[PDB]
Design a protein around this ligand. Structure first.
Ligand SMILES: [Cl-]
Ligand SMILES: [Cl-]
Ligand SMILES: [Cl-]
Length: 483
């Protein structure tokens, strides 16, 4: 068997936009995300699937059933977010110099918090309290994340920006968003600190910059192709993280971290190790050096330095790179660039999303983070698009084993949170990509246990990969699968 520390928790992560809607009265029509996925031009272009989040799994109404199943599965930790748009569905009073590039401070005080409170949707706040109270009553440890991509429409009209019009609310291109995010985060901690165990400011901010402004075929808002604006968004997001960290700390003493989308960068050949280092620099270290070391482009900002207590690792697959004349390049046919339901160029099976099976990458990412910064970590996401559940039992046990390995090497990793408990709205892919331990019937909103959920229950209830399931620490046999 492979046993975990007594204090290690197995759990799940989920997102509000992706899981909340689907029961009567649950619709949140007031985000950039909602506008984006309903947009007729985006649908016609096939940038989004045409599936709509309001037909989702219905966590807003059915949370007790989600939590019931989690409890029965032996889970002891959950990471969820509050949707900013639900709390402030209408715009806030303006503050603050918009033309100032750097936001070095955002003052939070009692009177400001009490004024914000006048504009907050109390029905939503109360409902979130009920959800989180139910969660805690199951003996679940609670990581509350503040932001998982959708912004209030009053801060970002993504269709206007897609069209090249920058005269309106521009999301992460505007420092107004930085100011309002810090105040929102402080406000939520002020309201919910009694329920929360740890905080995350954001989920996968690198996706906002990368898919929003470069990987524009992905259907991530606002889909405006610009290296320059991608940089501006990420700069603002970095400052927003620091100001939200300070904001939360002004009302709470609990840990505040951030959650990031990671890949394990792997060399095509033994001569490509330098290309791996460059890729890690360009995709990972620049961001964390900014919020941990205060380093940005080459200076040190004392208002950014030290603004992190823990790191949330989101890991799905690798990225293979090779050296080039000027720098490096990622390769198709490995990692997340494979055919769906096939095999990679390395002979490894791929998921419903075309993502390659590569559990060793999780060890790589965890140990790299540990050796560079020595901040403790949670694996905040790991999972696979697999409606049939063919690969997921292997994917689950294999990745969990790699976390055990990381701990054995000395890395401080305190839990593993699977993405996700149930199937949910996968943004531009709609409902077709099924990441749940539990399968959702979107017509009845019923939840079903895929066999991997029974495997997960064995792990979580024993706090170990038990002898009986050690054989799943292996690659799904490729011969019976599609090539
Ligand atoms: Cl990464
Ligand atoms: Cl450091
Ligand atoms: Cl269905």
């Amino acid at each position: 068997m492979y046993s975990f520390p007594n204090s290690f928790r197995f759990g799940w992560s989920q997102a509000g936009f992706q899981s909340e809607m689907g029961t009567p009265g649950s619709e949140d029509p007031n985000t950039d995300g909602y506008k984006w996925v309903h947009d007729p031009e985006n649908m016609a272009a096939g940038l989004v699937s045409g599936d709509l989040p309001e037909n989702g799994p219905g966590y807003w109404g059915n949370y007790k059933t989600f939590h019931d199943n989690a409890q029965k599965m032996g889970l002891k930790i959950a990471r969820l977010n509050v949707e900013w748009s639900r709390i402030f569905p209408n715009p806030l009073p303006r503050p603050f110099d918009e033309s100032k590039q750097d936001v070095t401070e955002v003052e939070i005080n009692e009177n400001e918090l009490k004024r914000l409170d006048e504009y907050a949707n109390k029905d939503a706040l109360n409902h979130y309290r009920e959800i989180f109270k139910d969660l805690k009553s199951r003996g679940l440890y609670f990581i509350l994340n503040m932001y998982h991509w959708p912004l209030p429409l009053w801060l970002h009209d993504p269709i206007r920006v897609r069209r090249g019009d920058f005269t309106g609310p521009s999301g992460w291109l505007s420092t107004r968003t930085v100011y309002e995010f810090a105040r929102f985060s402080a406000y939520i901690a002020w309201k919910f600190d009694d329920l929360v165990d740890e905080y995350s400011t954001m989920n996968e901010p690198n996706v906002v910059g990368g898919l929003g402004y470069v990987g524009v075929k992905s259907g991530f808002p606002p889909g405006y192709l610009s290296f320059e604006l991608s940089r501006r968004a990420m700069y603002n997001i970095i400052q927003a993280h620091a100001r939200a960290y300070d904001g939360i700390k002004s009302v709470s003493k609990k840990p505040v971290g951030i959650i990031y989308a990671n890949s394990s960068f792997q060399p095509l050949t033994d001569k490509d190790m330098e290309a791996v280092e460059m890729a890690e620099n360009d995709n990972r270290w620049w961001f964390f050096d900014a919020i941990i070391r205060g380093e940005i482009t080459k200076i040190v900002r004392d208002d950014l330095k030290g603004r992190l207590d823990w790191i949330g690792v989101n890991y799905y697959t690798r990225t293979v790179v090779k050296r080039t004349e000027k720098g490096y390049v990622s390769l198709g046919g490995y990692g997340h660039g494979c055919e769906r339901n096939s095999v990679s160029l390395a002979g490894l099976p791929t998921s419903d999303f075309g993502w390659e099976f590569f559990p060793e990458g999780l060890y790589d990412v965890l140990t790299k983070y540990w050796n560079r910064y020595h901040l403790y970590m949670y694996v905040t996401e790991n999972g696979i698009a697999d409606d049939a559940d063919y690969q997921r039992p292997y994917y689950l046990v294999s990745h969990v084993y790699q976390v055990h390995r990381a701990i054995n090497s000395g890395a401080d990793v305190r839990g593993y949170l699977h993405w996700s408990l149930a199937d949910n709205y996968e943004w531009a892919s709609g409902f077709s990509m099924r990441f749940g331990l539990l399968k959702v019937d979107y017509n009845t909103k019923r939840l079903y246990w895929r066999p991997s959920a029974l495997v997960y229950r064995e792990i979580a209830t024993n706090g170990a990969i038990t002898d009986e399931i050690e054989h799943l620490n292996s690659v799904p046999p490729v011969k019976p699968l599609r090539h």
